[PDB]
Symmetry: D3
Subunit: 155 residues, 6 copies
């Protein structure tokens, strides 16, 4: 019955895209973006659950656009909904050209995170209070995503 507002789990990350992070085209290597998402989704889940977490699954990722070298890479992740031991985490990724001002949504992800105790066994997590228009929409469309997730389980 424990309840925290979404704002509590909110995690921001701001990176600078450098040549070691690039692919063979000129944009950021997709794999780096994923490593960032997984990291921020974990921090988000930890802030909310107050315990160690494991990524149960990633329920969706789509690359709309890609950050170029020199861009600022903005990452934002928050807990959108919960089960008893699980937490749906939403991570969105923006590219920001600080020189020209141009900013676009590049990536978007949904992850299921599970909180675990010292011995690695799943642990009850507090439920999440949505407050803003965006949050309240994502809270209500989560059971629809979980039912869709549970059917993605059949091949």
């Amino acid at each position: 019955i424990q309840s925290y507002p979404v704002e509590r789990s909110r995690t921001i990350q701001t990176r600078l895209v450098l040549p070691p992070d690039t692919n063979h085209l000129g944009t950021i290597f997709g794999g780096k973006v994923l490593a960032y998402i997984d990291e921020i989704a974990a921090l988000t889940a930890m802030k909310h659950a107050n315990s160690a977490v494991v990524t149960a699954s990633i329920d969706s990722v789509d690359f709309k656009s890609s950050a170029t070298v020199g861009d600022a890479l903005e990452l934002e992740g928050f807990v959108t909904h919960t089960g008893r031991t699980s937490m749906e985490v939403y991570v969105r990724v923006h590219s920001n050209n600080l020189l020209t001002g141009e900013r676009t949504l590049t990536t978007e992800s949904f992850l299921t995170m599970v909180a675990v105790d010292e011995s690695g066994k799943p642990k009850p997590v507090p439920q999440v209070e949505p407050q803003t228009e965006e949050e309240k929409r994502l809270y209500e469309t989560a059971p629809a995503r979980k039912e869709n997730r549970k059917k993605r389980a059949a091949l």
Copy 2:
């Protein structure tokens, strides 16, 4: 109107899990796994389409368990189905303990890859011929997955 067998597009990775590859929970970093998954999917798509490709969307990553330090990561990637520019890539990860002989299924993943020109625009792709029992099975329930994937996008 071109068709190639699955065998053509198959790509195999075999990593050795080292301390830098690990995390605070003594096991492997899930972000490292995603990096290998994206990397091998890219190669798998490329070998099939003979061109540069981008990961359009990651559709599922199911973390069943994970490898410890000193294990061997075994990755298998192959194309399961094709549209006209898009193609489904399947990636399997195994943790293989070379001392004890114990083999474990680490994670399964489904991605959608799109071949592109040097202009960065969707490019016509060859088709895929399933052959083994596994290859046939994944191919048959490929339309059902693409329909399920469509539906997730409408919240």
Copy 3:
């Protein structure tokens, strides 16, 4: 001629400390922290100037404590004071252990950054307006730091 509030340049970074980030003593390798400091200072300055930046110099780094595996690294940069083409960037770093809720100030640093154009030559920067009392305090004690820093250069 141009002015902007501190709030505009503020940059937040949150990291998870993992084994490859650690050193031979079970703490976070100090060399990683400095790298994180430099990247966020560069972002901070870029956000305020809307141009490419170069780190002119680091004026001090102060290692008070340091993060452990599993901790969260919390980094905050913002612009504290400006010159004609230069900007003082203050970066502070916090270790946050989310399991027990313990939070500790790890590092503090003052850098000076210069905005640059196509040719890498100095570019006029907008000034900065402090808002909070910590921000105003830093803006006020900033000319003293530039003086101290000037005097430090001669001492060789």
Copy 4:
């Protein structure tokens, strides 16, 4: 003792060459190639011996050309010959341009791996039996390499 075919020990790696993997010229860093080679040889020895392994010595690395950005690195590793507690691993590295369909032989390597116990001491290994013709010719002229290597060890 036990005897296993070469196929059992065969290990394949395939990688995508990226800018961080490259050197100050157009191509891949030679040190990245070596790290992959040591890793694959280590994996090849383990799958065969079913124990931990150390790299006793590198006997040769022949750099013929090297992969450029966007190439796939095809790496092939297998056991060629066996001693008491030693194993000869041969590593084949290919650059494969998936666009053009151009495939070149990058490098070849011969390594000696030693199986070790919990306390890092030489451990008896199973023997290897060749099945393909190239596997046969590598097996035939194995002692001739070890004889050259022994002679090499004392030319100082």
Copy 5:
């Protein structure tokens, strides 16, 4: 009361600047240079103290210029002056284009390094002896730097 010549502590590092070491502006990413600096400072201090060390603070980092891809990066660190348990470490970083034979001073830095026992507690370090005229000059002007650093900490 113990005493060692600067010469003993001196640590040399030569690196090759590769594309992963670079930034969005063509030269070496400053955050990499700082990591190298911290590392060689630790190695310098470790040689003089014969114990584990921590970077207490950084006095200054002066970026004069920066290296390009393909350059040799030359680092030199030594201990310039000591306290009860602390050591001032000076590091200078030279860019060197071997092809053209052009050597340029890239960075300078002063750090305070504290020697520590097995439980992390600061422990006494031996004193240092300046020998060359440059080493003597740095030794003579060291107290003044600590004074400037002390007054720097007060400027908040």
Copy 6:
């Protein structure tokens, strides 16, 4: 006939062994060691020839023992002998435990480096003058290594 002393080519490197460098066994990952040798060899060869160089071959690496975490890693490279366009490079690796005083030879390697011009074509390098006892020995035994090297190519 152009000629420089061995000392001119000499390159020293001192790294500190951190956990990202370690392997699944407590000691330094051999791969990293190889990467360090290759680097110092290239620097050494560039310094002697005043041009870009390629690592033609590695003629031997001898692993005697390993550096452990927290050790100082000491690498030293110098040109032992020269052909027309090539340079034999000797790389010795020491692990130095700075707390205990223990220093041990962990590795030795011999590399053949080739100097190249702007467009990758080989280029004549100056001959090397040995001076120290160690230097003079390795110079006189280098043709013996050259004969053994070229023979290993036939098998």
